[PDB]
């Protein structure tokens, strides 16, 4: 019955901002590692930004490290990603994800849930 509902997605100028948000039902985001996959491409789903179950530990996609911050909100049971500095590359469906462990893996399908996407585009 675990839901992740992303939203925050939609269409925005290179060199603009969008904030994307994850509610999540039949978990909490304090037991878990929350992480942010997006699929840049029809063969690749990329690791994007994790945050790890005690809520100090995170990671960034070499890629983003600088431009995206990703944050949670443990009584509004939410995973944000602030996305700044947008630039065309970072076209993709974006995915939130949870794993049991308190921290993200390397791979969504190895991570116990993951939802259904919200697609951000980028464009000149």
């Known amino acids: 019955q675990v839901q992740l509902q992303e939203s925050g997605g939609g269409l925005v100028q290179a060199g603009g901002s969008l904030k994307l948000s994850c509610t999540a039902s039949g978990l909490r985001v304090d037991t878990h590692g929350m992480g942010w996959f997006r699929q840049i491409a029809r063969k690749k789903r990329e690791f994007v930004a994790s945050?790890?179950?005690?809520?100090?530990?995170?990671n960034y996609l070499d890629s983003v490290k600088g431009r995206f911050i990703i944050s949670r909100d443990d009584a509004k049971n939410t995973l944000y990603l602030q996305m700044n500095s947008l630039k065309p590359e970072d076209t993709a469906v974006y995915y939130c994800?949870?794993?049991?462990?308190?921290?993200?893996?390397?791979?969504?399908?190895?991570?116990?849930?993951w939802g259904q996407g919200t697609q951000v585009t980028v464009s000149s």
């Open positions: 994800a949870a794993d049991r462990s308190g921290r993200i893996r390397s791979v969504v399908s190895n991570n116990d849930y």
């Open positions: 945050i790890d179950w005690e809520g100090e530990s995170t």
